[PDB]
Each structure stands twice: as structure tokens, then as C-alpha cells.
Amino acid sequence: QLETAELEKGIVRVLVDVIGHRLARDKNNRPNVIRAYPSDNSNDKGLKPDQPFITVYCQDATTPYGWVLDKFVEDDAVCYRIAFQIPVLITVNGKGAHSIMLELKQRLEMSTTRDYLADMTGASVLDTGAIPNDYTYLNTDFENSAPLVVTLVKNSVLKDERGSIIERVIVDGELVYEEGQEPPEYTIHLDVDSK
Amino acid sequence: MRLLNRHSFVVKRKVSEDGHYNEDGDWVASQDVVSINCKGNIQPYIKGSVKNGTQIVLPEGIRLTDTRILFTVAELRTSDDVDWTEADIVMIKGHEYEVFMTMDWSEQLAHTSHYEYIIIRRDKMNAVRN
């Protein structure tokens, strides 16, 4: 199954291991990779972490690959498999954000990294966008940000608990000489079971 | 009979200032929150855009928001990203409030030094833990 929340969680763990040697460390010496719009229970907001930090944000989830990729039957349930394409926005904030972002791009193509990302997420990278060197004016100085749009593709399998598959077929057939003949010339009754 | 201590409310302060980001990536607020009664004056904030007790007719329902000013001598804090502070929650009629924006007249005069706070009602939201 596909859950955007789980996908963002999976990406964050990957970014910590992949690009962690260039970010800042908190009180637990954990590289500052956070999910966008942080918030705990109810309205408990989240503080802006230290500089060189990474923000992960799943922009949306489109399905340009058709309504249903395939429909198979599991043990006793009909399972639909839909193909999704999730654009995830990874943005690095802080001084020298562009240099940090560039390293991640050249590191998101390595086979070892993508194999790691394929695990614990279940998705595979489709492509990586362009990195704009953005300068925004907060209050006094300019904060460097380098957003990047990583596009992921994943297959979600959901089970319809109201399937009730076929196991027996009963066929009644008649043979006639012309279109009509209310008394059929010969009658066919079939009964095929899975036993 | 100081007007500065007319009303009495209960403030929840995140005393155990931990506020760390879990390994997964979400935000884990302070696990220890204490509620101790304070005293202050709560008045409606009348300034232009700021709306007090105003129902907002959205195409999804009717939401209600308000903004009150708070004169008090207590040092209530606000969410700060340098000292890892996590704001203070004021309570009026049960509904939780948040201390956005602060004015610090703490040392200026002798018998009139006070803090001025801008308390905002917290919007209704589904709660999920992390």
C-alpha cells in the first residue's frame, strides 16, 4: 500500500544517511532532516532547526499511468494495483545550500543509493528536476534555499474485502434449427465446479 | 486593587524544554507540561486587521477566531528557534490560546513594569501523536 506519510518518513531516513555529513546536528547529534510543516499533536508547532537543514515535502500524488495497472486475485480477495507518481520536494536551507543540494543530486544517481532508497520506501526515483539558487529576504539578511523536485513512482495494492470470486459455473444451452423453435431441438445443461 | 491582576487564568508551559525531531522526521513536543495559575488582564485587541470574536464564513463551514491582548507581570514566553522555547498556552473559557508576539516592559519603571502579550485562540484540528 502507498501512504504519503510513510514515504516522507522513508525519504528522511535515507537523506540522513546519504547527505548527513554536510548538515547540522541537534542535541542528539542527529542531522537536521525534517518533514515540511512540522506539527505535533493538535496545534503544537515545530521550531525551525539549525542552518544547513533539509525539508522534505510531498507535493501531491498523480496517476498519469491509467486508472488501474492490473487486477489480480489473492487467496480469497480481489486486489487492485494502481500506479502512482509522487513528486517529493527536497529543499536545503542555509548558507551554501546550492553546494549541498548539488552533492545530493550527484548522489541520488548512484546505484547503491537508489537501491537503499528502494528499500524502506518501496518506490524508485523517476527523475530529478533543476536546482534553482534561491535567495529570500527574511528580516535582515538573505537565506539561501535550493529546492529540488524528486519524482518517485510506486505501486499501491489494495484488497477489496467484498470480492467473492467465482468457483462454480452453471450453463444452460439449447440447440435449434432456426431462430425461434420454442421447443428446442436439444438442451444442454452444464455444471462445472472447482472441486 | 490593581487592575493588572483582575482576571486569573491557567498557563501551560512546556517546562521540560526538549522539543526534538524523532528519527522518523516528525516533531515531538515536550512531554512534560505543567499548569500553574497566573494573574493578568485580558482585553480584546482592537487594531485594524486583527479580528475579535469574528466568525469567518468559509465554503467549508463557519470558523471562529479571536485575538486578545494580555497585560501581566508574568514572564510568559513565545516559541523561539534559538533557545528552543515552545511558547505558552493561556486558557479562557476552556479554549486554548497561544502567545504570539511579545512586548517587554520588564525593567522600565518601578511599580508599573509589565509584559504585554498577544494571545490567539488555537484553531480546531485533529490531533495525532508522534
mmCIF file of C-alpha atoms in Angstrom:
data_model
loop_
_atom_site.group_PDB
_atom_site.id
_atom_site.type_symbol
_atom_site.label_atom_id
_atom_site.label_comp_id
_atom_site.label_asym_id
_atom_site.label_seq_id
_atom_site.Cartn_x
_atom_site.Cartn_y
_atom_site.Cartn_z
ATOM 1 C CA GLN A 1 0.000 0.000 0.000
ATOM 2 C CA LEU A 2 1.030 3.617 -0.619
ATOM 3 C CA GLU A 3 0.952 6.168 2.212
ATOM 4 C CA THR A 4 2.425 9.625 1.604
ATOM 5 C CA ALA A 5 3.269 9.960 5.302
ATOM 6 C CA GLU A 6 5.285 6.732 5.237
ATOM 7 C CA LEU A 7 7.009 7.771 2.004
ATOM 8 C CA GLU A 8 8.174 11.043 3.550
ATOM 9 C CA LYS A 9 9.371 9.163 6.636
ATOM 10 C CA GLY A 10 11.315 6.758 4.433
ATOM 11 C CA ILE A 11 12.956 9.552 2.455
ATOM 12 C CA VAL A 12 14.065 11.378 5.608
ATOM 13 C CA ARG A 13 15.920 8.323 6.908
ATOM 14 C CA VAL A 14 17.630 7.970 3.521
ATOM 15 C CA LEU A 15 18.695 11.620 3.356
ATOM 16 C CA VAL A 16 20.172 11.382 6.857
ATOM 17 C CA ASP A 17 22.462 8.548 5.778
ATOM 18 C CA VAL A 18 23.134 9.804 2.245
ATOM 19 C CA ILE A 19 23.596 13.536 2.827
ATOM 20 C CA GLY A 20 24.263 13.926 6.541
ATOM 21 C CA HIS A 21 27.943 14.819 6.642
ATOM 22 C CA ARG A 22 27.116 18.327 5.428
ATOM 23 C CA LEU A 23 24.115 19.341 7.574
ATOM 24 C CA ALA A 24 23.904 20.474 11.199
ATOM 25 C CA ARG A 25 23.436 18.348 14.302
ATOM 26 C CA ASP A 26 20.883 18.797 17.069
ATOM 27 C CA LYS A 27 21.227 17.951 20.770
ATOM 28 C CA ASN A 28 21.164 14.221 19.898
ATOM 29 C CA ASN A 29 23.771 14.690 17.150
ATOM 30 C CA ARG A 30 21.139 13.873 14.510
ATOM 31 C CA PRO A 31 21.470 15.516 11.068
ATOM 32 C CA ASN A 32 18.700 18.081 10.679
ATOM 33 C CA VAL A 33 16.315 16.491 8.166
ATOM 34 C CA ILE A 34 12.699 17.367 8.940
ATOM 35 C CA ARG A 35 9.296 16.915 7.354
ATOM 36 C CA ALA A 36 7.672 20.053 5.993
ATOM 37 C CA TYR A 37 5.157 21.964 8.121
ATOM 38 C CA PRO A 38 6.203 20.282 11.390
ATOM 39 C CA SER A 39 3.434 19.796 13.929
ATOM 40 C CA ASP A 40 2.871 17.537 16.923
ATOM 41 C CA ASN A 41 -0.474 16.609 18.498
ATOM 42 C CA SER A 42 -3.193 19.190 17.834
ATOM 43 C CA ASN A 43 -1.546 22.554 17.115
ATOM 44 C CA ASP A 44 1.880 22.048 18.714
ATOM 45 C CA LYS A 45 4.075 23.638 16.040
ATOM 46 C CA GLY A 46 7.720 22.866 15.316
ATOM 47 C CA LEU A 47 10.700 25.168 15.599
ATOM 48 C CA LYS A 48 12.935 25.961 12.653
ATOM 49 C CA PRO A 49 16.034 23.750 13.028
ATOM 50 C CA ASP A 50 19.660 24.859 12.771
ATOM 51 C CA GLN A 51 21.211 26.001 9.486
ATOM 52 C CA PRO A 52 22.142 23.636 6.711
ATOM 53 C CA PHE A 53 18.919 21.697 7.279
ATOM 54 C CA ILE A 54 16.779 19.755 4.809
ATOM 55 C CA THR A 55 12.991 19.937 4.463
ATOM 56 C CA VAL A 56 11.053 17.107 2.797
ATOM 57 C CA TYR A 57 7.603 17.824 1.358
ATOM 58 C CA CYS A 58 5.425 15.511 -0.748
ATOM 59 C CA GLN A 59 3.804 17.962 -3.140
ATOM 60 C CA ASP A 60 0.995 15.726 -4.428
ATOM 61 C CA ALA A 61 0.280 12.277 -5.884
ATOM 62 C CA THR A 62 -0.793 11.986 -9.523
ATOM 63 C CA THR A 63 -1.778 8.888 -11.519
ATOM 64 C CA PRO A 64 -0.903 9.577 -15.169
ATOM 65 C CA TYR A 65 -0.361 5.848 -15.699
ATOM 66 C CA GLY A 66 -4.003 4.838 -16.063
ATOM 67 C CA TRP A 67 -6.737 4.150 -13.530
ATOM 68 C CA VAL A 68 -5.708 0.559 -12.747
ATOM 69 C CA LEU A 69 -2.386 -1.047 -13.645
ATOM 70 C CA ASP A 70 -3.684 -4.592 -13.103
ATOM 71 C CA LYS A 71 -6.197 -6.602 -11.068
ATOM 72 C CA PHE A 72 -5.132 -9.949 -9.608
ATOM 73 C CA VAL A 73 -6.789 -12.317 -7.147
ATOM 74 C CA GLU A 74 -5.027 -13.147 -3.881
ATOM 75 C CA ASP A 75 -6.027 -16.070 -1.615
ATOM 76 C CA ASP A 76 -9.706 -15.123 -1.420
ATOM 77 C CA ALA A 77 -9.699 -11.381 -2.123
ATOM 78 C CA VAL A 78 -9.632 -9.278 -5.284
ATOM 79 C CA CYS A 79 -6.616 -6.949 -5.145
ATOM 80 C CA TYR A 80 -6.289 -3.807 -7.258
ATOM 81 C CA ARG A 81 -2.850 -2.416 -8.109
ATOM 82 C CA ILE A 82 -2.768 1.280 -9.017
ATOM 83 C CA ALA A 83 0.379 3.049 -10.212
ATOM 84 C CA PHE A 84 1.191 6.407 -8.616
ATOM 85 C CA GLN A 85 3.783 9.108 -9.257
ATOM 86 C CA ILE A 86 4.702 11.201 -6.212
ATOM 87 C CA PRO A 87 6.642 14.468 -6.665
ATOM 88 C CA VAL A 88 8.665 14.989 -3.475
ATOM 89 C CA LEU A 89 10.198 18.432 -2.908
ATOM 90 C CA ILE A 90 13.555 18.339 -1.129
ATOM 91 C CA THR A 91 14.839 21.806 -0.206
ATOM 92 C CA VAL A 92 18.090 22.668 1.569
ATOM 93 C CA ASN A 93 18.166 25.865 3.632
ATOM 94 C CA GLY A 94 21.220 27.700 4.921
ATOM 95 C CA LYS A 95 24.499 29.196 3.731
ATOM 96 C CA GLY A 96 25.994 27.168 0.900
ATOM 97 C CA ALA A 97 22.696 25.422 0.222
ATOM 98 C CA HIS A 98 23.395 25.127 -3.510
ATOM 99 C CA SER A 99 26.646 23.232 -2.954
ATOM 100 C CA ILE A 100 24.890 20.842 -0.565
ATOM 101 C CA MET A 101 21.983 20.315 -2.958
ATOM 102 C CA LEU A 102 24.323 19.594 -5.878
ATOM 103 C CA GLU A 103 26.060 16.834 -3.919
ATOM 104 C CA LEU A 104 22.728 15.120 -3.254
ATOM 105 C CA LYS A 105 21.806 15.162 -6.948
ATOM 106 C CA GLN A 106 25.116 13.568 -7.931
ATOM 107 C CA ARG A 107 24.481 11.109 -5.098
ATOM 108 C CA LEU A 108 20.849 10.267 -5.943
ATOM 109 C CA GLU A 109 22.015 8.686 -9.218
ATOM 110 C CA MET A 110 24.450 6.193 -7.681
ATOM 111 C CA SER A 111 23.080 2.659 -7.861
ATOM 112 C CA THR A 112 23.877 1.975 -4.201
ATOM 113 C CA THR A 113 21.868 4.990 -3.028
ATOM 114 C CA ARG A 114 18.854 4.190 -5.205
ATOM 115 C CA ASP A 115 18.932 0.580 -4.007
ATOM 116 C CA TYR A 116 18.882 1.874 -0.428
ATOM 117 C CA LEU A 117 16.015 4.213 -1.324
ATOM 118 C CA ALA A 118 14.147 1.329 -2.983
ATOM 119 C CA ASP A 119 14.153 -0.333 0.440
ATOM 120 C CA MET A 120 12.222 1.164 3.395
ATOM 121 C CA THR A 121 10.155 3.207 0.919
ATOM 122 C CA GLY A 122 9.141 0.826 -1.862
ATOM 123 C CA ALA A 123 9.460 3.495 -4.584
ATOM 124 C CA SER A 124 12.106 4.221 -7.214
ATOM 125 C CA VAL A 125 13.375 7.568 -8.475
ATOM 126 C CA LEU A 126 11.964 8.627 -11.831
ATOM 127 C CA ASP A 127 13.883 11.866 -12.420
ATOM 128 C CA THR A 128 15.351 14.870 -10.630
ATOM 129 C CA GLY A 129 14.428 18.438 -11.547
ATOM 130 C CA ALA A 130 16.608 21.534 -11.672
ATOM 131 C CA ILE A 131 18.160 23.254 -8.661
ATOM 132 C CA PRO A 132 17.398 26.992 -8.506
ATOM 133 C CA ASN A 133 19.775 29.018 -6.336
ATOM 134 C CA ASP A 134 17.122 30.947 -4.387
ATOM 135 C CA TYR A 135 17.824 33.923 -2.124
ATOM 136 C CA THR A 136 14.966 35.055 0.118
ATOM 137 C CA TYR A 137 14.887 38.048 2.461
ATOM 138 C CA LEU A 138 13.707 37.012 5.908
ATOM 139 C CA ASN A 139 14.170 40.061 8.138
ATOM 140 C CA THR A 140 17.777 41.304 7.904
ATOM 141 C CA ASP A 141 19.832 39.032 5.626
ATOM 142 C CA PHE A 142 19.170 36.632 2.761
ATOM 143 C CA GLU A 143 18.621 32.917 3.378
ATOM 144 C CA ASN A 144 19.866 30.550 0.686
ATOM 145 C CA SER A 145 17.486 27.774 -0.350
ATOM 146 C CA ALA A 146 17.955 25.169 -3.086
ATOM 147 C CA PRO A 147 14.667 23.362 -3.748
ATOM 148 C CA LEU A 148 14.685 20.181 -5.804
ATOM 149 C CA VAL A 149 11.737 18.138 -7.056
ATOM 150 C CA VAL A 150 12.466 14.410 -6.876
ATOM 151 C CA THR A 151 9.747 12.408 -8.643
ATOM 152 C CA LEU A 152 9.028 8.934 -7.274
ATOM 153 C CA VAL A 153 6.930 6.135 -8.764
ATOM 154 C CA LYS A 154 5.310 3.436 -6.647
ATOM 155 C CA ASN A 155 2.654 0.741 -6.980
ATOM 156 C CA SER A 156 -0.107 0.543 -4.371
ATOM 157 C CA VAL A 157 -2.012 -2.708 -3.831
ATOM 158 C CA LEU A 158 -5.368 -2.592 -2.046
ATOM 159 C CA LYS A 159 -7.663 -5.521 -1.286
ATOM 160 C CA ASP A 160 -11.414 -5.326 -1.861
ATOM 161 C CA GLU A 161 -12.944 -7.170 1.094
ATOM 162 C CA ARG A 162 -16.125 -7.639 -0.969
ATOM 163 C CA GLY A 163 -14.721 -9.753 -3.800
ATOM 164 C CA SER A 164 -16.436 -13.151 -3.575
ATOM 165 C CA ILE A 165 -14.648 -14.806 -6.523
ATOM 166 C CA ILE A 166 -16.212 -17.352 -8.902
ATOM 167 C CA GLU A 167 -15.887 -21.042 -8.101
ATOM 168 C CA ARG A 168 -18.817 -22.676 -9.957
ATOM 169 C CA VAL A 169 -20.458 -22.111 -13.344
ATOM 170 C CA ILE A 170 -23.882 -23.421 -14.391
ATOM 171 C CA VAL A 171 -24.597 -23.212 -18.125
ATOM 172 C CA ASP A 172 -27.980 -23.914 -19.730
ATOM 173 C CA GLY A 173 -27.905 -24.106 -23.514
ATOM 174 C CA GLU A 174 -30.331 -25.045 -26.264
ATOM 175 C CA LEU A 175 -29.781 -26.063 -29.890
ATOM 176 C CA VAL A 176 -32.341 -25.207 -32.568
ATOM 177 C CA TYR A 177 -32.701 -25.427 -36.352
ATOM 178 C CA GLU A 178 -33.921 -21.866 -36.981
ATOM 179 C CA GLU A 179 -34.219 -18.663 -34.981
ATOM 180 C CA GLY A 180 -37.242 -19.483 -32.845
ATOM 181 C CA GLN A 181 -38.478 -23.057 -32.405
ATOM 182 C CA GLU A 182 -39.996 -22.645 -28.909
ATOM 183 C CA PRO A 183 -39.355 -26.367 -28.288
ATOM 184 C CA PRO A 184 -35.558 -26.595 -28.551
ATOM 185 C CA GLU A 185 -34.200 -29.496 -30.582
ATOM 186 C CA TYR A 186 -31.630 -30.343 -27.903
ATOM 187 C CA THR A 187 -30.931 -28.934 -24.451
ATOM 188 C CA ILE A 188 -27.538 -28.525 -22.777
ATOM 189 C CA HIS A 189 -27.082 -28.259 -19.008
ATOM 190 C CA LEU A 190 -23.551 -27.819 -17.656
ATOM 191 C CA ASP A 191 -22.254 -27.618 -14.083
ATOM 192 C CA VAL A 192 -18.535 -27.096 -13.515
ATOM 193 C CA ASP A 193 -17.034 -26.788 -10.042
ATOM 194 C CA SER A 194 -13.598 -26.064 -8.624
ATOM 195 C CA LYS A 195 -13.589 -29.391 -6.746
ATOM 196 C CA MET B 1 -6.861 46.826 43.816
ATOM 197 C CA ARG B 2 -4.521 46.573 40.826
ATOM 198 C CA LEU B 3 -6.349 46.135 37.520
ATOM 199 C CA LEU B 4 -3.255 44.283 36.298
ATOM 200 C CA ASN B 5 -4.389 41.261 38.311
ATOM 201 C CA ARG B 6 -8.171 41.275 37.716
ATOM 202 C CA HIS B 7 -8.519 38.051 35.739
ATOM 203 C CA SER B 8 -6.937 34.733 36.695
ATOM 204 C CA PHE B 9 -6.115 32.031 34.149
ATOM 205 C CA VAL B 10 -4.115 28.801 33.940
ATOM 206 C CA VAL B 11 -0.998 28.704 31.775
ATOM 207 C CA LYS B 12 0.530 25.519 30.344
ATOM 208 C CA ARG B 13 4.303 25.911 29.971
ATOM 209 C CA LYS B 14 6.471 23.268 28.295
ATOM 210 C CA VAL B 15 8.835 23.277 31.270
ATOM 211 C CA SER B 16 10.884 20.310 30.030
ATOM 212 C CA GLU B 17 12.267 22.123 27.009
ATOM 213 C CA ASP B 18 13.195 19.158 24.816
ATOM 214 C CA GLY B 19 11.244 19.610 21.567
ATOM 215 C CA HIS B 20 13.306 17.225 19.451
ATOM 216 C CA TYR B 21 12.763 15.764 15.987
ATOM 217 C CA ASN B 22 12.336 11.999 16.117
ATOM 218 C CA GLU B 23 14.355 9.612 13.957
ATOM 219 C CA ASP B 24 11.431 9.298 11.546
ATOM 220 C CA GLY B 25 11.348 13.046 10.917
ATOM 221 C CA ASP B 26 8.227 14.301 12.686
ATOM 222 C CA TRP B 27 8.128 16.794 15.577
ATOM 223 C CA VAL B 28 7.903 15.531 19.162
ATOM 224 C CA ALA B 29 6.849 18.313 21.517
ATOM 225 C CA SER B 30 7.837 18.484 25.173
ATOM 226 C CA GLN B 31 6.420 15.523 27.074
ATOM 227 C CA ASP B 32 6.124 17.413 30.389
ATOM 228 C CA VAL B 33 3.572 20.242 30.504
ATOM 229 C CA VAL B 34 2.641 21.925 33.786
ATOM 230 C CA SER B 35 -0.420 24.067 34.513
ATOM 231 C CA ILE B 36 0.002 26.793 37.129
ATOM 232 C CA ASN B 37 -2.457 29.636 37.742
ATOM 233 C CA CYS B 38 -1.311 33.159 36.852
ATOM 234 C CA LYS B 39 -2.917 36.605 37.016
ATOM 235 C CA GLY B 40 -3.371 39.273 34.373
ATOM 236 C CA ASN B 41 -5.754 41.492 32.447
ATOM 237 C CA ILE B 42 -7.313 40.064 29.275
ATOM 238 C CA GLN B 43 -8.819 42.634 26.920
ATOM 239 C CA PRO B 44 -9.927 42.491 23.272
ATOM 240 C CA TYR B 45 -7.269 43.650 20.814
ATOM 241 C CA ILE B 46 -8.715 46.422 18.638
ATOM 242 C CA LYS B 47 -6.292 47.231 15.821
ATOM 243 C CA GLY B 48 -7.280 47.240 12.150
ATOM 244 C CA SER B 49 -6.946 43.811 10.544
ATOM 245 C CA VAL B 50 -6.979 41.893 13.849
ATOM 246 C CA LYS B 51 -10.423 40.331 14.266
ATOM 247 C CA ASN B 52 -12.000 39.726 17.671
ATOM 248 C CA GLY B 53 -14.725 37.123 18.058
ATOM 249 C CA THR B 54 -15.315 37.085 14.308
ATOM 250 C CA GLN B 55 -16.986 34.165 12.555
ATOM 251 C CA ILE B 56 -15.412 33.507 9.151
ATOM 252 C CA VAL B 57 -17.833 32.084 6.583
ATOM 253 C CA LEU B 58 -15.689 29.625 4.625
ATOM 254 C CA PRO B 59 -17.166 27.356 1.925
ATOM 255 C CA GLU B 60 -16.461 24.534 4.378
ATOM 256 C CA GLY B 61 -18.322 25.841 7.442
ATOM 257 C CA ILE B 62 -18.173 28.681 9.931
ATOM 258 C CA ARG B 63 -14.893 29.067 11.795
ATOM 259 C CA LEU B 64 -14.466 31.391 14.769
ATOM 260 C CA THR B 65 -11.263 33.204 15.707
ATOM 261 C CA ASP B 66 -10.328 35.930 18.158
ATOM 262 C CA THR B 67 -7.299 37.877 19.394
ATOM 263 C CA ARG B 68 -6.966 39.264 22.919
ATOM 264 C CA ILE B 69 -4.228 41.403 24.446
ATOM 265 C CA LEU B 70 -2.875 40.344 27.836
ATOM 266 C CA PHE B 71 -1.340 42.708 30.381
ATOM 267 C CA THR B 72 0.526 40.797 33.079
ATOM 268 C CA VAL B 73 3.696 40.792 35.160
ATOM 269 C CA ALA B 74 4.461 37.119 34.479
ATOM 270 C CA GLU B 75 7.255 36.333 32.003
ATOM 271 C CA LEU B 76 5.263 34.186 29.559
ATOM 272 C CA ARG B 77 7.490 33.043 26.646
ATOM 273 C CA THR B 78 6.839 32.537 22.942
ATOM 274 C CA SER B 79 8.107 29.915 20.501
ATOM 275 C CA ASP B 80 11.753 30.764 19.829
ATOM 276 C CA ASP B 81 14.107 28.945 17.459
ATOM 277 C CA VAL B 82 17.355 29.871 19.243
ATOM 278 C CA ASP B 83 16.716 28.894 22.893
ATOM 279 C CA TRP B 84 14.399 26.038 21.825
ATOM 280 C CA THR B 85 11.477 27.587 23.686
ATOM 281 C CA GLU B 86 7.969 26.400 22.794
ATOM 282 C CA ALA B 87 5.527 29.232 23.581
ATOM 283 C CA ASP B 88 2.875 29.332 26.319
ATOM 284 C CA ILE B 89 -0.803 28.362 26.285
ATOM 285 C CA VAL B 90 -3.317 30.643 28.012
ATOM 286 C CA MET B 91 -6.846 29.409 28.748
ATOM 287 C CA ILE B 92 -10.095 31.369 28.615
ATOM 288 C CA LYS B 93 -13.407 29.519 28.945
ATOM 289 C CA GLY B 94 -11.627 26.219 28.325
ATOM 290 C CA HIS B 95 -10.379 27.071 24.833
ATOM 291 C CA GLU B 96 -6.594 27.007 24.476
ATOM 292 C CA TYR B 97 -4.741 30.146 23.371
ATOM 293 C CA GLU B 98 -1.252 30.833 22.040
ATOM 294 C CA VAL B 99 1.124 33.667 22.928
ATOM 295 C CA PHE B 100 2.156 35.076 19.544
ATOM 296 C CA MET B 101 4.156 38.337 19.635
ATOM 297 C CA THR B 102 5.533 39.874 22.837
ATOM 298 C CA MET B 103 6.321 43.299 24.278
ATOM 299 C CA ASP B 104 8.868 43.505 27.087
ATOM 300 C CA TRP B 105 8.472 46.410 29.518
ATOM 301 C CA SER B 106 10.151 44.444 32.291
ATOM 302 C CA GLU B 107 12.675 46.871 33.802
ATOM 303 C CA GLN B 108 11.486 50.307 32.658
ATOM 304 C CA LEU B 109 9.619 51.718 35.666
ATOM 305 C CA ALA B 110 9.396 50.754 39.349
ATOM 306 C CA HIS B 111 5.748 49.923 40.136
ATOM 307 C CA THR B 112 4.469 49.713 36.548
ATOM 308 C CA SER B 113 6.855 47.356 34.723
ATOM 309 C CA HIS B 114 4.806 44.700 32.956
ATOM 310 C CA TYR B 115 4.699 42.411 29.940
ATOM 311 C CA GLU B 116 2.140 42.776 27.151
ATOM 312 C CA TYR B 117 1.167 39.614 25.287
ATOM 313 C CA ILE B 118 -0.946 38.941 22.216
ATOM 314 C CA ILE B 119 -2.929 35.758 22.761
ATOM 315 C CA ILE B 120 -4.618 33.999 19.842
ATOM 316 C CA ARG B 121 -7.201 31.229 20.020
ATOM 317 C CA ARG B 122 -5.937 27.936 18.628
ATOM 318 C CA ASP B 123 -7.872 26.555 15.674
ATOM 319 C CA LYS B 124 -9.681 23.226 15.826
ATOM 320 C CA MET B 125 -7.559 20.411 14.395
ATOM 321 C CA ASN B 126 -7.454 16.630 14.554
ATOM 322 C CA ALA B 127 -4.730 15.506 16.954
ATOM 323 C CA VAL B 128 -2.162 12.843 16.038
ATOM 324 C CA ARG B 129 0.770 11.813 18.219
ATOM 325 C CA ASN B 130 4.377 11.229 17.172
#
